[PDB]
Design a protein around this ligand. Structure first.
Ligand SMILES: CCC(=O)Nc1nc(C)c(S(=O)(=O)Nc2cccc(C#N)c2)s1
Length: 167
């Protein structure tokens, strides 16, 4: 028994909720929150900018130090950094950005990073301004992640479409 409440049951291991991931993390303070990162950990917009803004830019400061030491992530890759005021840990995961011409096949590789964590609060990878169809991202999530994932979808109209079209 954990502290996520309000999640509609999609599968055995996937629950889903209509929420902004930032406001969700502030309430639950999960062990792991997933950021929809880019390879440079440049948190300008979307979930990354919203998560980063909620940490008063401490996420960006930590991220810049990580990149200066280690170089960029791979598309499909991840790193674990601090969760700051939002979670114990932030798993920064790079899904492919369709709008930059990255290979959508790497979405499954991105979701495999979630399997290293027993429980996560996460968004649908490659969604929003990453340019992929959320219905596809949800399908890959359900077919790839085996650990317990609590998904957040910000737009009500999209959340409703995701639930109503889920097979
Ligand atoms: C101002 C606060 C705010 O925007 N919070 C949000 N929380 C969620 C779950 C969304 S999302 O539903 O759009 N998922 C989503 C997934 C991947 C990338 C992007 C992008 N860019 C978005 S946005």
């Amino acid at each position: 028994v954990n502290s996520f409440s309000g999640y509609l049951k999609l599968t055995d291991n996937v629950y889903i909720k209509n929420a902004d991931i930032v406001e969700e993390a502030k309430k639950v303070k999960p062990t792991v929150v997933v950021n929809a990162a880019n390879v440079y950990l440049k948190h300008g917009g979307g979930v990354a900018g919203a998560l980063n803004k909620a940490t008063n830019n401490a996420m960006q400061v930590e991220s810049d130090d990580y990149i200066a030491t280690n170089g960029p992530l791979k598309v499909g890759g991840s790193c674990v950094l601090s969760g700051h005021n939002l979670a114990k840990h932030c798993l920064h995961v790079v899904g492919p950005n369709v709008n930059k011409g990255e290979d959508i096949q790497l979405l499954k590789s991105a979701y495999e990073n979630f399997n290293q964590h027993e429980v996560l609060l996460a968004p649908l990878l490659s969604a929003g301004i990453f340019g992929a169809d959320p219905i596809h991202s949800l399908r890959v999530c359900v077919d790839t992640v085996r650990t317990n994932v609590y998904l957040a979808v910000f737009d009500k109209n999209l959340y409703d479409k995701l639930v109503s079209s889920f097979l």
